[PDB]
């Protein structure tokens, strides 16, 4: 299969091999890099970087915008939209923008796909052909967890703070420091945080409990809820729960955890007047007939997307994907 | 028409005549009382009381449960459910429980109807025949705003704190004090609070701006968002916005303010598998054919309810109102 590097919440990271760590810093860092040391192995260089800003009062940092550089093309992901800056007249545009469920998906011919929740999280999937050829925060794709702490010089350092700060992009940006305990800083929020995050240990995720241990995700939920004290704590809780749900869906199990009282969705909003063709799919539709993807072609490469999806009627089965309405014929 | 006494948020009150004031207290208080001084004017006594608990750290108090006493019948409204305690074998049950939209509606033959949002708010509508015969926090229904501060002894006192504390139900409960400024107490939340509550001054409520001045509601939204720092600030903001929306709907204007990113609803959750018969009605359906209310009878006495409503198909047009599904025939 394809390994996944996941970044979400307040500095929560998961390497391709499987190593997990927490690191926060008000700077710009590189997640995945190509051709480390300038070794152009007959492949175009691709680089993914992230920008972190201090959110909250404890000192935690959360991702704000993501910049993608590949083949001379620069893309900006901020405020829930895509902005193109670096344009190359020659060659051909290698990225395709597609909105599926609640995630923004970008596909590249080189084999790199990214999933964006448009608020804080980001998921990276890499083709197996790039094994042992990438460097960055996600670590080398050598399937070895212990040696994922290379500090930009092919040297493993046990200090997670030093490893994280070695990949900073701005030389003038300040060095990171050891974070404090958000729950200790804000004791009065601990009860509400525990009550909200107890759903992870509830019967809803009983099936996924055996496959994936939720202790780390539960701790992340508690810490984020404790720290998300600057407004919109519901967003922090929903992002943590959605990250755990996506992790569960990656294995293959499907869980329908969303309720009208817990992180609700408004699929009916997109429904046109007098018609109802939108529903919430927890597993997600495998393949949908669109103008860009006809009925014959499905392209079910990525699985694990959730959100509102249009259920076109037997008449006009193909979805426009541009006007947000079922169309009889795609031009 | 019928005057409305509205209680919502952190001690926000609106008298029947129109007087507005703010008062918070960790005690039990009587909203509307009947037969003041024991004057049984050939009418059964009805009494509505509320219980307030300290929510947050600033010191603000919000309603938790509501108890209704009338004709020897006692009802409890807590945890989003109705519990019956006082049961009278003789006579007949005078209250009917009906769930419409997002509000819980109780109807009485005497002419008293209450709307409950199940979280913090409560709306009281009184028949004009009870003019000048009721006492309590809502004040006498004499259509005079200046003399609404009777301190349980037919004496008007300019001290709002004294007027509020004169109606306490527990003699041993402590006296209330002057509240502080939540935004001053929590300065870092002011920017987010203002950004969220700025929707009131936006173009969405332009039509209602002329009829109703939103300055008081804007201040209430800002104060509640500043004080709602113990978790679930989104609930506080949504309750304030919904209170303003109900106030707008009382005049007659209809506003569709809910968006998937601002206080969303999950009407699709109640939809059975393979069927879609639920939609969000901002104005609210005037009358719906139910088992208790057939097609011939509409009973459009109360207007201004919003939430998810079932749109039954031409087949099985009457709604069950008990099994949450359209039924062909009501037994
Ligand atoms: Ca490694
Ligand atoms: Ca009066």
Three-state SS letters, B141-188: CCCCCCCCCECCCCCECCCHHHHHHCCECCCCCCCCCCCCCHHHHCHH
- For residue B115, what are its two tokens? 């709307």
Among B267, B78, B5, which Cα is nearest to A266's? Answer: B267
Contacts of B278 in chain A (CB under 8 A): 268
Q: What is the resolution of this structure in A?
A: 2.9
A 235-274 near B (Cβ less than 8 A): 258-260, 264-269, 271
Nearby residues of B172 by Cβ (< 8 Å), 6 or more positions away = none
Among A239, A301, A255, which Cα is nearest to A9's? Answer: A239
Q: What phi and psi values does residue B34 have, to the nearest 5 degrees?
A: -120, 150
Distances (CA, A) of B161 to B11, B16, B54, B66, B85: 12, 19, 17, 21, 32
* Residue entry with tokens 């169309």: A327
Among B51, B48, B16, B52, which Cα is nearest to B32's? Answer: B48
Give the integer Cα–Cα distance in Å for B212 and B206: 10
Nearby residues of A305 by Cβ (< 8 Å), 6 or more positions away = A100, A101, A102, A103, A105, A115, A284
Q: CA angle, corner A148, sides to A145 and A150, nearest 5?
A: 160
Are the CB atoms for A16 and A161 separated by under 8 Å? no
Q: How many angstroms does the Cα of residue A150 sit away from the middle of ligand 1?
A: 8
Other CB atoms within 10 Å distance of the CB of residue A43: 13
Q: What phi and psi values does residue A259 have, to the nearest 5 degrees?
A: -130, 160
Nearby residues of B287 by Cβ (< 8 Å), 6 or more positions away = B293, B297, B298, B299, B300
The answer to whether A303 faces chain B, any CB pair under 8 Å, is no
Give the integer Cα–Cα distance in Å for A74 and A87: 7
Among B105, B73, B119, which Cα is nearest to B321's? Answer: B105
Contacts of A234 in chain B (CB under 8 A): 232-234
Are the CB atoms for B175 and B29 separated by under 8 Å? no
Phi-psi region of B272 (alpha: psi -120 to 50; beta: other; left: phi over 0): beta
Contacts of A237 in chain B (CB under 8 A): none
Closest partner residue to A265 among B266, B271, B280, by Cβ? B266
Ligand closest to Cα of B3 equals 2
The answer to whether A52 faces chain B, any CB pair under 8 Å, is no
Which strand (E) or helix (H) includes residue A208?
helix A206-211
Q: What is the DSSP string of B120-145?
A: S-EEEEE-GGGTT-EESTT--SSS-S
The answer to whether B189 faces chain A, any CB pair under 8 Å, is yes
Q: How many angstroms does the Cα of residue B149 sit away from the middle of ligand 2?
A: 7
- For residue A206, what are its two tokens? 């009983």
Among B53, B10, B46, which Cα is nearest to B31's? Answer: B46
The answer to whether B230 faces chain A, any CB pair under 8 Å, is yes
Shortest distance, CA B1 to any CA of chain A (angstroms): 33
Which strand (E) or helix (H) includes residue A69?
strand A61-70
Dihedral of CA atoms A60, A63, A65, A66 in degrees, nearest 10, equals 140
Distances (CA, A) of B219 to A185, B12, B206, B222: 29, 11, 18, 5
Among A109, A45, A102, which Cα is nearest to A74's? Answer: A45
Give the integer Cα–Cα distance in Å for B6 and B249: 14
Closest partner residue to B234 among A229, A234, A260, by Cβ? A234
Task: Sketch the domain layout of chain B as residue ranges.
Answer: 4-165, 182-251, 265-331
Give the integer Cα–Cα distance in Å for B137 and B31: 5
Give the integer Cα–Cα distance in Å for A221 and A243: 10
Give the integer Cα–Cα distance in Å for A189 and A194: 9
Asked how this structure was determined, the answer is: cryo-EM
Are the CB atoms for A13 and A49 separated by under 8 Å? no
- The DSSP call for residue B95 is E
Are the CB atoms for B98 and B91 separated by under 8 Å? no
Are the CB atoms for B330 and B316 separated by under 8 Å? no
């Amino acid at each position: 299969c394809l390994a996944t590097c996941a970044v979400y919440g307040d500095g929560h990271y998961l390497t391709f091999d499987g190593q997990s760590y927490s690191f926060n810093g008000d700077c710009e860092y590189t997640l995945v890099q190509n051709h480390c040391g300038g070794k152009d192995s007959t492949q175009d260089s691709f680089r993914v970087v992230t920008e972190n800003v201090p959110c909250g009062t404890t000192g935690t940092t959360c991702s704000k915008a993501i910049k993608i550089f590949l083949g001379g093309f620069e893309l900006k992901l901020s405020h829930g939209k895509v902005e193109v800056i670096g344009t190359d007249e020659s060659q051909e545009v290698p990225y395709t923008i597609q909105q599926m469920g609640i995630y923004l998906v970008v596909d590249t011919d080189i084999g790199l796909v990214l999933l964006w929740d448009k608020k804080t999280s980001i998921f990276i999937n890499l083709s197996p052909e790039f094994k042992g050829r990438v460097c960055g925060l996600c670590g080398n794709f050598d399937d070895i967890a212990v040696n994922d702490f290379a500090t930009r010089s092919r040297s493993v350092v046990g200090d997670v703070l030093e490893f994280g700060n070695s990949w900073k992009l701005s030389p003038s940006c300040p060095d990171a420091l050891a974070p404090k305990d958000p729950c200790t800083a804000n004791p009065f929020r601990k009860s509400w945080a525990q009550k909200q995050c107890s759903i992870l240990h509830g019967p809803t995720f009983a099936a996924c409990h055996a496959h994936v241990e939720p202790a780390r995700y539960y701790e992340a939920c508690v810490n984020d809820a404790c720290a998300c004290d600057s407004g919109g704590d519901c967003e922090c809780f929903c992002t943590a729960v959605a990250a755990y749900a996506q992790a569960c869906h990656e294995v293959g199990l499907c869980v329908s955890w969303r309720t009208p009282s817990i992180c609700p969705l408004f699929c009916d909003y997109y429904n046109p007047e007098g018609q109802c063709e939108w529903h919430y799919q927890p597993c997600g539709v495998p393949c949908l007939r669109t103008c860009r993807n006809p009925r014959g072609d499905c392209l079910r490469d990525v699985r694990g997307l959730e959100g509102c999806y249009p259920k076109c009627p037997p008449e006009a089965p193909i979805f426009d994907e541009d006007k947000m309405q079922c169309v009889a014929t795609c031009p």
